[PDB]
């Protein structure tokens with residue numbers, strides 16, 4: 411370092427600030443994109459460059475070549491968080507800014523392209539070790555492993571205190587990406603907001619808000635321009651349908667979402683998901699963090715494209 415400011419070509423330098431940015435198909439640029447976002451979100455001082463780079467490269471190595479839950483997904487979720495942090499400058503601690511971009515990069519480490527359900531039904535060792543949020547507790551465990559490799563402690567300068575706090579922000583952040591947890595979390599946030607009890611000085615309230623951000627970042631493929639959204643849906647179903655196939659081999663009819671024989675109903679299934687999860691998610695997030703409203707608007711836009719698909723208008 412430390413007069414060594416990372417820069418992106420003009421188009422990326424401008425579009426990276428927007429919620430709907432797509433990080434693109436040039437895999438070798440994704441590390442530079444992430445370091446750019448850390449340096450602007452957090453500072454050039456937050457992390458030792460050599461250690462950050464070594465961390466990023468080990469994190470990348472520990473994502474598998476699955477259709478959806480891959481390194482690209484990791485970096486895409488990190489960028490959505492960067493857009494939130496950058497649109498809500500003053501709402502967030504120095505520790506939170508440090509923790510949340512790492513949490514996002516690490517949140518699906520060593521994902522195998524299967525649901526927590528399938529691990530339970532297959533009777534995978536991870537399901538014995540972690541009874542709920544099975545893959546999510548795994549992802550946090552892989553983060554700690556990588557943080558513990560020689561020359562990988564990016565938090566080296568934090569006090570004992572701060573270090574324990576940052577790893578606790580990351581742990582909760584990662585556990586929150588378990589969508590089964592999202593539903594209750596958002597209902598409580600919605601009630602706290604409407605009864606006016608929401609208080610960002612209550613750590614237990616901050617936790618829930620960061621949980622909702624995590625869901626929002628995780629789901630952020632539904633907040634992209636339609637051609638990105640449509641092509642990403644292909645990837646997520648490529649995994650679900652393989653898991654369906656694996657269910658059939660255990661002697662279990664999978665749910666329709668995972669049955670490649672019920673492909674035809676993708677459009678209607680996306681509609682449910684926009685109505686039941688995505689729209690409520692970005693709606694409650696906008697109420698709590700007004701500047702995140704572009705994510706709701708882009709989500710609404712994509713619901714209407716799926717309505718178009720159904721009507722045979724595409």
Ligand SMILES: Cn1cc(-c2ccncc2)c(-c2ccc(OCc3ccc4ccccc4n3)cc2)n1
Nearest residue numbers: 589631632642643646666667672675676679680683
């Ligand atoms: C956490 N997470 C990410 C995503 C996601 C979504 C879109 N693009 C990228 C990522 C999802 C998700 C949720 C539902 C879904 O399909 C819903 C559904 C329900 C009944 C069906 C019946 C027949 C056919 C299809 C059917 N699809 C597909 C993906 N979960």
Ligand SMILES: [Mg+2]
Nearest residue numbers: 517518587588
């Ligand atoms: Mg996950």
Ligand SMILES: [Zn+2]
Nearest residue numbers: 517518587628
């Ligand atoms: Zn994810």
